[PDB]
């Protein structure tokens with residue numbers, strides 16, 4: 131119908147090779163933070179057949195056993211046997227980690243008061259919130275994440291023992307306009323691809339994916355006789371994980387955020403401590419956006435911030451409310467400036483960003499879940 | 513003023529470590545395509561001190577000397593001596609490349625007519641165009657790219673011989689609304705950080721960056737006494753390239769596209785042949801968007817497509833014109849469907865995507881430059 135449109139988002143499972151890397155990078159970060167809350171961490175992970183490589187820069191007082199940390203993360207994901215294509219017990223773990231560049235350290239944080247630490251890099255970051263779900267997230271990405279979580283649940287509980295950890299999902303929703311906001315109408319198309327054992331047949335998989343995965347996740351009111359299902363569309367997915375496709379940290383940044391809604395500034399989250407504004411300022415911007423929506427000021431909002439390396443205050447803060455506020459964007463920006471301090475050395479205090487909770491963020495999206503500090507709205511004064 | 517806002521985009525130079533990886537990945541792709549136009553290539557590159565690692569999946573009839581291809585790419589970028597932190601002559605080149613998964617091959621392209629080849633993965637992709645510049649790109653990202661290009665020019669011509677290849681820039685523009693379109697007013701803030709030799713002092717660098725870089729790129733009509741300049745804001749950037757910061761392919765996807773404008777579906781471009789719709793469908797979507805703007809149908813437009821692995825036709829196509837067309841989005845979508853075929857096996861023909869031109873795309877953005885096929889608008893019939 132006129133005024134309607136389709137929009138698609140995707141998500142991936144815990145054993146998707148890029149997500150393996152994000153989780154390992156954040157397991158490394160958490161291990162450092164457990165011993166040194168001020169650790170400077172920039173840990174990239176690369177995964178291919180039989181290999182996890184850590185590359186990057188860490189300056190920390192912690193003593194971290196990288197072999198143990200990496201292998202325990204892979205064990206948790208479920209890659210525990212050569213029959214599955216990857217095994218935490220027997221893979222190669224290679225480490226190419228150096229100290230943080232002293233030139234960066236001197237320009238960012240050396241001899242600086244914590245509240246006045248400089249941004250760890252330049253960059254731009256966005257925060258988004260939408261009233262279309264209680265958790266202020268787009269329905270497309272929420273459903274896509276939940277489909278992957280359901281696969282992992284049914285794998286771990288033994289219901290569908292042919293499942294393996296590598297999966298991808300994609301959800302297309304038909305939306306209608308509503309005064310600048312968007313309203314989901316129906317699910318138009320669902321894709322699910324998941325790695326599987328050599329014995330199970332395609333028809334058994336497709337039936338299970340429809341009846342035990344989709345129907346257990348997606349409300350029936352969104353599904354109808356016209357909904358299109360692409361279930362195991364490649365026909366065979368026995369080879370998977372890093373053996374099927376190289377993984378790298380920071381290659382699922384749209385899955386990690388809003389599924390394509392809002393906007394993205396390009397920076398990856400995993401493997402980075404709070405001085406890297408790619409993560410901390412994106413978390414703070416989500417917190418601002420969600421606070422504006424939960425505060426009743428907007429129904430939908432996009433916030434941009436930006437930084438220069440070594441400079442503590444943002445270079446720019448901007449807000450767009452899609453026509454969903456009675457207040458001008460100028461007024462909302464004044465409210466934001468009166469209620470939030472987006473220096474990284476203040477964000478760290480407000481969002482408790484030295485705490486080792488980051489591995490938990492590294493699958494199923496960083497936003498919309500589990501009442502992390504950036505998901506608890508701030509009560510606004512104005 | 514009310515109705516105005518700030519917006520920031522960034523770009524990076526040819527020697528930025530992530531961009532080094534993109535360029536190497538596409539040098540590898542081009543080397544394969546020179547000998548085997550049908551090569552299946554998924555080449556990731558990782559860079560750290562003294563190391564280029566290639567990881568991924570290639571099935572090809574070509575005989576490629578990876579040592580030579582990698583080292584020649586690094587030579588071109590300018591890393592030719594240990595004094596600069598990296599040297600093509602003496603770095604380590606490690607290769608962890610396997611064949612493409614046979615399970616992918618059978619589901620995507622084996623025994624398929626070329627026009628009916630399946631998408632090489634699921635995913636979503638966007639194309640964007642804006643009439644604010646002749647090349648239909650946002651001014652923020654165009655200026656940011658041009659600042660990095662100017663640095664490389666002045667490095668290569670010996671004017672500023674203290675420059676090294678690793679650089680980043682960022683441009684904040686004040687915009688005003690214009691009937692759904694956006695109109696740039698002035699440059700609010702510029703950041704430039706660039707790697708340099710041990711001898712040159714900060715004041716010499718800052719003066720040169722203002723007088724010989726910014727003033728040679730940014731029209732004076734956009735600069736005024738209030739413009740803020742953050743030039744070498746870290747104070748020291750002698751350590752750079754992969755030694756200062758690990759690089760990975762596909763970690764500059766917003767730099768590669770629209771600088772944060774429009775939208776992004778998450779997929780990286782470099783190192784991938786045309787069957788990977790992350791690249792080919794994003795290129796085709798840019799071509800659609802630019803064709804609509806150059807055709808006079810819109811002033812600003814965002815196109816989304818999406819795919820399932822193994823399926824040739826897009827699962828969804830959607831268009832949003834920001835209120836800048838007299839035609840409804842429904843009508844524009846009908847025009848697009850009548851004029852474009854977004855199957856990957858047709859895109860390859862329309863955009864000549866077996867030709868080895870990809871290394872040229874891998875710095876300074878994939879869009880808005882050099883009349884690549886996706887930048888030449890299609891004449892639309894309706």
Ligand SMILES: COc1ccc(-c2c(Nc3ccccn3)[nH]c3c(C4=CCCCC4)c(-c4ccccc4)nn3c2=O)cc1
Pocket residue numbers: 132133134135136137306307308309310311312390391392393452774775814815816830831832841842
């Ligand atoms: C008066 O009330 C409203 C409420 C919403 C909108 C609106 C909208 N209407 C629409 C109507 C018919 C057909 C297509 N579209 N379409 C979109 C999109 C897109 C949709 C499909 C392609 C891709 C971008 C987006 C968007 C999504 C992600 C990232 C960036 C932008 N926003 N958006 C909107 O706000 C307009 C007016």
Ligand SMILES: COc1ccc(-c2c(Nc3ccccn3)[nH]c3c(C4=CCCCC4)c(-c4ccccc4)nn3c2=O)cc1
Pocket residue numbers: 392393432433434448449450459460514515516517518519688689690691692693694772773774775834
């Ligand atoms: C009637 O004519 C128009 C023309 C343009 C707009 C408009 C707009 N007005 C605006 C006015 C005052 C203050 C802030 N904003 N602000 C934006 C933004 C953003 C701006 C700053 C934060 C981040 C997103 C974006 C956008 C950019 C990148 C990615 C996604 C969305 N689009 N956008 C628009 O279209 C509205 C009406």
Ligand SMILES: C[S@@+](CC[C@H](N)C(=O)[O-])C[C@H]1O[C@@H](n2cnc3c(N)ncnc32)[C@H](O)[C@@H]1O
Pocket residue numbers: 146147148296297298323324364365366367368369370371374375376553554569570612613615616619632633634821
């Ligand atoms: C399709 S692979 C990307 C293309 C691949 N690099 C190549 O060489 O063609 C991308 C992701 O899809 C999933 N995948 C891998 N093998 C697959 C298969 N046989 N069927 C469906 N999806 C698959 C995995 O999640 C993988 O990380």
Ligand SMILES: C[S@@+](CC[C@H](N)C(=O)[O-])C[C@H]1O[C@@H](n2cnc3c(N)ncnc32)[C@H](O)[C@@H]1O
Pocket residue numbers: 171172187188230231233234237250251252439528529530678679680705706746747748749750751752753756757758
């Ligand atoms: C600042 S580094 C990212 C943080 C880094 N990984 C760490 O360990 O803190 C990101 C990019 O900024 C640039 N960069 C590196 N050293 C820098 C310095 N001393 N001053 C300014 N920018 C620098 C390079 O382009 C590099 O790829």
Ligand SMILES: [Cl-]
Pocket residue numbers: 148633
């Ligand atoms: Cl992927």
Ligand SMILES: [Cl-]
Pocket residue numbers: 390391392393
């Ligand atoms: Cl949006």
Ligand SMILES: [Cl-]
Pocket residue numbers: 251530
């Ligand atoms: Cl970077």
Ligand SMILES: [Cl-]
Pocket residue numbers: 772773774775
């Ligand atoms: Cl935009």
